[PDB]
Design a protein around this nucleic acid. Structure first.
Ligand SMILES: [Mg+2]
Ligand SMILES: [Mg+2]
Ligand SMILES: [Mg+2]
Ligand SMILES: [Mg+2]
Ligand SMILES: [Mg+2]
Ligand SMILES: [Mg+2]
Ligand SMILES: [Mg+2]
Ligand SMILES: [Mg+2]
Ligand SMILES: [Mg+2]
Ligand SMILES: [Mg+2]
Ligand SMILES: [Zn+2]
Lengths: 189, 53, 102, 72, 142, 68, 138, 165
RNA sequence: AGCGGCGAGUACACGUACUUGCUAGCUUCUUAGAGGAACAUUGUGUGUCUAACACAAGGAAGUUUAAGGCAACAACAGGUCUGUGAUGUCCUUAGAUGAACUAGGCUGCACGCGUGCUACACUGAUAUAUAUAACGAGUAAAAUAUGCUUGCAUACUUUUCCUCCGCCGAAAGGCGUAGGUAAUCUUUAUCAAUAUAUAUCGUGAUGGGGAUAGAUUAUUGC
């Protein structure tokens, strides 16, 4: 009987990837009315994976110095953004944000390895926790730079970024950055 | 006449001086210590000040 | 009646001992006394620099001088109480006996 | 690359700005983009359309975000 | 919904001498005159009984004439003394509020008067240096 | 790290070497014995010596201990 | 009849008095509905929603707050309310029912009954904060 | 008894609550709703006047712009009446600290500032003539009379009835 | 220092808010003395199964629980004789390098370097309103009351430090009188600003930014 923001349920949402299922949390302890919990998530290596997924999003909107510590303002920005996503393409706003997280991170990268003294840009694989961190980071910066010196407000840009990311369209900052990483990795190995 | 020590010195640096040296620089005045900082750090223990952290 | 005894000292070592002696000594004379009242402890702070010269990494030391105070109230006569004070109280605790007549 | 938004409503533009009422999402940024009007004007037309109940509030408004929608 | 026609709205005005006074709101538009601040424009706009919630492009002729008479000799209105420039005027001993061109004529004369007298401050205006006691060793470097 | 200096290990081996009968496999019980048997000004090292003594006993059950 | 429990945060202290009554709840002499930051009002209402309206009809609660700021004061009030209802049951109702309620609040989260130990760190000379040092130039 | 209408009432004042309420004093009504609603009442019934001079002054040092509401005099005064209920014996120095804001000093760092006193004094003097506040013969400051306290309390109960009923 | 208890009130309810006199008991809140608590405790895993490490449970707390204080042999021709009635040599000692008094300078501006403050805006500026901290500090001279023709009597009085409140003034400030040598008063169930709510501006070196300049006023001080 608990809703997010008192309006949306997350009692029928699924991941449908089977790789990120254990890494993003919409479950017993992560069900909260509001995304403000004063938890201690950076004391062990993997406790970051138990934070509610929407609270990780609001923790990233407070960036570039001018907005450090303004947590309540970030909650408001995300709350109104989830309303727009519902108004157009009528669906569960949190289900859309889950789809964006599953499509916004690269599945492989490249790194410098000096195996035989010779160094190459040989490719590697990405772990599920690294994929989730990248998706949250790439979405926020895309919205943040879109709204600088623009008529559209910060919340409208965020809603448009999330919809486009989950639709695999190459008009989002996240998808075209993901493809630039994977193109190089394919070239190198 | 006489013009020896006729400039008013009711305030400023020349009004007061170290209780011990007679030096006129870096005087502690909080709680009326009236001691220059170099002298005070030497005698700080016997006065009652202690270092804890 | 309603005589007040106040104690002040830089030394916590001695001031609790003297505060103990008065409470026990007054109990023998079968007097009704109010237990010690420990007022908040205050500290005097001075933060000067080392190095009488000017060079070097600027380092500082933090000095502290902390003061203690107690407070005992009781119902008795003045002359017996005032001679009860001069019982060889060690001379780091100065005693002020004040009549809170109103 | 300068914007040249109009700062009032012409006789010709008067009839055209009212169709906006039939919009999925209604916000000053979207009104100003479709009709090339100011943002101070876009707030004026929303307040006019809202008082006569041609436009339905989607949720509780804020002083920084004022989305609406068509009545149906 | 206000539906004013284009032919009634005019884009460039001429309020005082040599001013343009474009398509802004009345408070901000009057700040293009050379001695009208944001504080003074708001007061002058109120003593003229004009609405602050409209653009300067739909101001009737009488409103423009009324405002000009207020900027001139603002003491017969209720504008007090401490809202004025030139509070002693050094020449007639009276309180006046300069504006536009006049303003420029007053600034030029002040510099030459304390230059012919060889005053220290006017002597530094001639050398093109700072006059208010700045250090001028690391800043102002061009 | 939590490595025990020789001050702790010297004293703890003497307690086992001299009062073997009284000591058991409970930390609290072995703690009270150490309080009156030895002389330790601070309680923090009183706890650590007793904790080591209890650890010594568990090793005895598997056989002899080199150095005791 | 009457108990007194407290909740704490950084420097905020909230003391709740729980008695038998008719259902009122008040803070500093006003209703709970005048707690200022509106977006944080759900925090205060969480414990009341979990236990339900059934078990709370016959109680009155009074709370006083002192010290801290916007966020710390709100969190201390949550802790004061949650602990107070638990302790009232221990003293005047069977405690097997108390265990059931304490299970309910725990399955949502801790910190409804357990205080937080985090506290501000002192600063040291040679820098602006506890860790940040003045910029070196070479 | 009161026929006047209440100012605009936003939503989120109408959400259900999990406890029970009371409405007897002003400690039971929303602070912002009362101040705006009561401010119109003083203006309409002509209980105080807006000093002419106040038409061209700012409220404090750190503002550098005028209040731009032309009803600030009444709105500020009505909030003073609510404050005197919360603190009985209050002077002018207290109210200068209450209406403070930060002042931007050019390229120098910001500080806190202090409000002007003549505005605060003139409002307190007018209310004494209306018989709502009195200057205590005992200790200090000036508090609410019985007439003043009753008038404030009665309006608050009216406001709540207009919202929830 | 608090919470209660007994009255008296002003208001409204099928008991709540506040004001005011008196004053059973108690220590949750406040202050401060003495004690307890954590040892890798218990499981699983790694390890020469030794010294020891990792994960889980319980627990307020398990990176020695967090931050500091003190600091071993020895060195540097490191800085300080401009802190010292600490001090060795040399110089000066009545036309003084001693002690003062009057006026200037240490800040002087074609340039280079280091630590910083304010910004380049809408996650903003302006205006109003609401809610909300912790460590501190405070009392021999000049001046004030009354005359002799600022000079010398008389009071060694209230004066000086933080200043409530009342009145005047656009403001900065001025005038008159309380309290305090202080958990007692300033003043802190609050002495702040980020925050929050509503409205105006609207992508335009603009309502961003506030350097450089002109005129006027009041305090500190010979
Ligand atoms: Mg420089
Ligand atoms: Mg910092
Ligand atoms: Mg303000
Ligand atoms: Mg206690
Ligand atoms: Mg020396
Ligand atoms: Mg000289
Ligand atoms: Mg210099
Ligand atoms: Mg430095
Ligand atoms: Mg500006
Ligand atoms: Mg500009
Ligand atoms: Zn000295």
């Amino acid at each position: 009987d608990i809703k997010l923001f008192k309006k949306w349920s997350y009692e029928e949402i699924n991941i449908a990837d089977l790789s990120l299922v254990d890494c993003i949390a919409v479950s017993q302890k992560a069900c909260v009315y509001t995304p403000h919990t004063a938890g201690r998530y950076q004391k062990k290596r993997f406790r970051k994976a138990l934070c509610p997924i929407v609270e990780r999003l609001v923790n990233s909107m407070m960036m570039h110095g001018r907005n450090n510590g303004k947590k309540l303002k970030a909650i408001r920005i995300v709350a109104y953004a989830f309303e727009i996503i519902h108004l157009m393409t009528g669906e569960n706003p949190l289900q859309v944000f889950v789809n964006a997280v599953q499509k916004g991170g690269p599945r492989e990268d490249s790194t410098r390895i000096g195996s035989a003294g010779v160094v190459r840009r040989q490719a590697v694989d990405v772990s599920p926790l690294r994929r989730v961190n990248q998706a949250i980071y790439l979405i926020c910066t895309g919205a943040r730079n879109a709204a600088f010196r623009n008529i559209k407000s910060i919340s409208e840009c965020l809603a448009e970024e999330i919809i486009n990311c989950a639709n695999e369209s190459s008009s989002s900052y996240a998808i075209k950055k993901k493809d630039e990483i994977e193109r190089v990795a394919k070239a190198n190995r | 006449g006489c013009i020896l020590n006729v400039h008013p010195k009711k305030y400023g640096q020349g009004s007061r001086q170290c209780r011990v040296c007679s030096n006129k620089h870096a005087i502690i005045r909080k709680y009326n210590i009236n001691i220059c900082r170099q002298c005070f750090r030497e005698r700080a223990d016997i006065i009652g000040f202690k270092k804890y952290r | 009646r309603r005589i007040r005894i106040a104690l002040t000292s830089k030394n916590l070592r001695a001031i609790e001992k003297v505060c103990s002696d008065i409470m026990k000594g007054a109990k023998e004379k079968n007097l009704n006394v109010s237990g010690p009242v420990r007022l908040p402890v205050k500290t005097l702070r001075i933060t000067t620099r080392k190095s009488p010269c000017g060079e070097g990494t600027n380092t500082w030391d933090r000095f502290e001088l902390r003061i203690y105070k107690r407070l005992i109230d009781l119902y008795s006569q003045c002359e017996v109480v005032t001679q009860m004070t001069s019982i060889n109280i060690d001379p780091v605790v100065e005693v002020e006996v004040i009549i809170t007549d109103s | 690359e300068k914007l040249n938004h109009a700062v009032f409503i012409d006789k010709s533009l008067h009839s055209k700005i009212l169709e906006c009422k039939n919009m999925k999402v209604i916000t000053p940024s979207a009104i100003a983009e479709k009709y090339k009007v100011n943002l101070s004007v876009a707030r004026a037309v929303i307040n006019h359309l809202a008082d006569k109940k041609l436009i339905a509030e989607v949720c509780v408004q804020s002083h920084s975000q004022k989305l609406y929608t068509k009545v149906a | 919904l206000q539906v004013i026609d284009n032919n009634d709205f005019q884009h460039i005005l001429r309020i005082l001498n040599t001013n343009v006074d474009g398509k802004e709101k009345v408070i901000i538009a009057l700040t293009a005159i050379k001695g009208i601040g944001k504080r003074m424009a708001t007061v002058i706009c109120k003593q003229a009984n004009v609405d602050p919630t409209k653009r300067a492009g739909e101001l009737t002729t009488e409103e423009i004439d009324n405002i000009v008479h207020i900027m001139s000799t603002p003491t017969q209105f209720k504008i007090p003394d401490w809202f004025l420039n030139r509070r002693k005027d050094l020449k007639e001993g009276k309180n006046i509020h300069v504006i536009a061109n006049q303003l420029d004529s007053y600034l030029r004369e002040d510099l030459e008067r304390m230059k012919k007298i060889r005053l220290h401050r006017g002597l530094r205006h001639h050398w093109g240096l700072r006059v208010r006691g700045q250090h001028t060793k690391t800043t102002g470097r061009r | 790290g939590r490595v025990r200096t020789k001050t702790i290990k010297r004293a703890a081996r003497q307690i086992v070497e001299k009062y073997y009968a009284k000591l058991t496999l409970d930390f609290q019980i072995n703690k009270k014995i150490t309080e009156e048997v030895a002389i330790i000004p601070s309680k923090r090292m009183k706890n650590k010596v007793a904790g080591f003594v209890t650890h010594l006993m568990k090793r005895i059950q598997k056989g002899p201990v080199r150095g005791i | 009849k009457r108990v007194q429990t407290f909740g704490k945060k950084k420097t905020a202290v909230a003391v709740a008095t729980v008695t038998n009554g008719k259902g009122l709840i008040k803070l500093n002499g006003k209703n709970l509905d005048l707690v200022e930051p509106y977006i944080l009002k759900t925090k205060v209402y969480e414990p009341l929603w979990l236990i339900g309206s059934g078990k709370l009809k016959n109680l009155d609660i009074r709370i006083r707050v002192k010290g801290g700021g916007q966020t710390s004061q709100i969190y201390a009030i949550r802790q004061a309310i949650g602990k107070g209802i638990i302790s009232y049951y221990q003293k005047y109702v069977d405690e097997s029912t108390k265990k059931e309620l304490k299970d309910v609040l725990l399955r949502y989260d801790r910190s409804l009954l357990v205080g937080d130990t985090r506290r501000c760190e002192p600063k040291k000379f040679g820098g602006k904060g506890a860790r940040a040092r003045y910029q070196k130039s070479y | 008894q009161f026929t006047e209408d209440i100012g605009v009432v936003n939503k989120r004042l109408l959400e259900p609550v999990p406890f029970v309420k009371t409405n007897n004093c002003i400690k039971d009504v929303d602070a912002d709703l009362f101040i705006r609603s009561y401010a119109t009442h003083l203006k309409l019934h002509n209980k105080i006047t807006y000093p002419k001079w106040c038409t061209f002054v700012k409220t404090g040092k750190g503002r550098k712009l005028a209040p731009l509401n032309e009803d600030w005099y009444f709105i500020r005064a009505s909030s003073i009446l609510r404050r005197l209920y919360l603190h009985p014996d209050i002077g002018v120095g207290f109210l200068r600290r209450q209406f403070s804001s930060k002042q931007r000093r050019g390229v120098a760092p910001n500080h806190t500032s202090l409000a002007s006193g003549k505005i605060l004094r003139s409002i307190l003097q007018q209310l004494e003539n209306l018989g709502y506040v009195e200057q205590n013969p005992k200790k200090k400051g000036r508090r609410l009379t019985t007439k003043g306290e009753n008038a404030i309390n009665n309006f608050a109960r009216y406001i709540n009835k207009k919202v929830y009923n």
